[PDB]
């Protein structure tokens, strides 16, 4: 249903919230009352019309298929290339992942996408992550890997990953400090 502003624009008149609600109730009654074409043609004058983007699969020089993606977490940006076939190796910045991320939490984050779609040990990954700390880098690489793997999993699996939150870019970033207070939300100790 068009908004009160749209209805006002059509009627070149100033309306009220309750007037708009009355009119919308009347139109809804009209819709429910088996409105045919003769009535639907009128009604539609007041109607206003209202999935992951799979990357293309590229091919290297040696003919191996892969998918490239990127993901950002906090200040960390990661570019990940996932090959169609592999032995589960993950090389981050040219270093093996268990060496780059000595933290079990970060290794678990790397695992989370592949483990979810039941493709552990089936894909090789080459990731390059810059900026942020260890955890931000792990999250960015996780997002990039999930997006790249979307090209190799089925559409139902892609939707399941999206529902599990493996393809959403975490918008949580550090909140700026504000003048006159200790931090983003911390206030200076009040002195009654």
């Amino acid at each position: 249903w068009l908004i009160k502003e749209e209805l006002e624009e059509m009627l070149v008149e100033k309306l009220s919230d309750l007037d708009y609600m009355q009119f919308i109730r009347l139109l809804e009654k009209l819709l429910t009352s088996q409105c045919g074409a003769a009535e639907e043609e009128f009604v539609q004058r007041f109607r206003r019309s209202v999935k992951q983007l799979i990357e293309p699969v590229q091919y290297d020089e040696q003919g191996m298929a892969f998918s490239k993606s990127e993901g950002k977490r906090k200040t960390a940006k990661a570019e990940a290339i996932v090959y169609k076939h592999g032995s589960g190796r993950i090389k981050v910045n040219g270093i093996d992942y268990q060496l780059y991320f000595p933290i079990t939490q970060d290794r678990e984050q790397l695992m989370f996408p592949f483990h979810f779609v039941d493709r552990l040990g089936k894909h090789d990954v080459t990731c390059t992550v810059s900026g942020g700390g260890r955890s931000a880098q792990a999250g960015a690489i996780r997002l990039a890997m999930a997006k790249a793997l979307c090209s190799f999993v089925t559409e139902d699996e892609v939707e399941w990953m999206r529902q599990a939150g493996l393809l959403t870019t975490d918008p949580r970033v550090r909140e700026r400090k504000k003048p006159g207070q200790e931090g983003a939300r911390r206030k200076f100790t009040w002195k009654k």
Partner: protein, 349 residues
């Protein structure tokens, strides 16, 4: 798990399968040097089973085909952190002990170049420092390991301990070891004398020497020991390190200098440094050159499966999902087949 427990017969046929160490052999050969976490595992399981791996197999092959006439060869086990260097070295140590070699086992040369409360000055050479605590500890461990040859080996010089006390040519090396252990002020000198005597007598065919040094890169690196004047001390000023350096030369024969690099516990080395030059430095590589580097890598899938099965048979993986294929894949991914990471994860899983 292999029925074979002799450390001389197992070969490629037993690769990726376990090899037992009897409690007596563990208490005799290994009073020191075993990884702390492996010692904890041994105490918990009541068993000491080491997977036989290609590094240990190759080093055993070399030691069996060695020609004692030729100068003692230097073998250097190198690999990423927690790949199994120390345990491969311990496997070879056990093989040599069962073959009746004299095992001169330094459990961690790093300990000798850091965290030393008692740093006196050597009476034999005033330009060098003593580490009585470490010297006495290692002397006790050495006596425990090689007591059998300790009475059969005689000294070939006169060794003055005090201005009045001395040990005479023809005396057992047990006298030297006992003097060092009992009189802690003479521990470093006893270690030096023992090293000299073993090095010289290995050339005479009296026995076969295995100088098994873990963390060998500590000798030619830096140290975190400061003089009373807050002045840093290089390794050569330490009497123990200097004597072990002398031992590490191939000028002698009748044995083998087996050693293992270890970034863990090293000083002023980055976490990801594992290559021979990266860990040894110019001085260390110059000293060891020529040497045979042996790569210790993560578990291959067969070894990983064998280790997981060993833990499951011991019931260590108490998590209900560990036996599942999905749990095994998760373990493999988390540890990337790294022995230390897999063991640590299974320690609480």
């Amino acid at each position: 798990r292999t029925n074979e427990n002799d450390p001389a017969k197992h070969g490629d046929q037993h690769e990726g399968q376990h090899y037992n160490i009897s409690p007596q052999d563990l208490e005799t050969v290994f009073p020191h040097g075993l990884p702390p976490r492996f010692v904890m595992q041994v105490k918990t399981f009541s068993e000491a089973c080491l997977m036989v791996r290609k590094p240990a197999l190759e080093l055993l092959h070399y030691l069996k085909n060695t020609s004692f006439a030729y100068p003692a060869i230097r073998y250097l086990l190198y690999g990423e952190k927690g790949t199994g260097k120390t345990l491969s070295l311990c496997h070879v140590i056990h093989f040599c002990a069962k073959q009746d070699w004299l095992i001169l086992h330094i459990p961690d040369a790093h300990l000798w170049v850091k965290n030393c409360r008692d740093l006196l000055q050597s009476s034999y050479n005033k330009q060098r420092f003593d580490q009585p605590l470490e010297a006495s500890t290692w002397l006790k461990n050495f006596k425990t390991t090689n007591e059998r040859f300790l009475n059969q080996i005689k000294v070939q010089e006169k060794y003055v301990w005090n201005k009045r006390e001395s040990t005479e040519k023809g005396s057992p090396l047990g006298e030297v070891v006992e003097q060092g252990i009992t009189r802690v002020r003479n521990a470093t000198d006893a270690v030096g004398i023992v090293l000299k005597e073993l090095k010289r007598q290995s050339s005479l065919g009296m026995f076969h020497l295995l100088v098994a040094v873990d963390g060998i890169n500590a000798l030619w690196g830096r140290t975190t020991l400061k003089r009373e004047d807050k002045s840093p001390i290089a390794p050569e000023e330490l009497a123990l390190v200097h004597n072990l350096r002398k031992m590490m030369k191939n000028d002698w024969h009748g044995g083998a200098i087996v050693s293992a690099l270890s970034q863990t516990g090293s000083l002023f080395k980055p976490r990801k440094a594992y290559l021979p030059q990266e860990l040894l430095g110019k001085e260390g590589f110059d000293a060891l050159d020529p040497f045979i580097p042996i790569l210790v890598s993560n578990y291959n899938p067969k070894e990983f499966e064998s280790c997981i099965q060993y833990y499951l048979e011991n019931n260590w993986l108490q998590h209900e999902k560990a036996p599942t294929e999905e749990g095994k894949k998760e373990l493999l991914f988390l540890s990337n087949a790294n022995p230390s990471l897999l063991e640590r994860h299974c320690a609480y899983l």
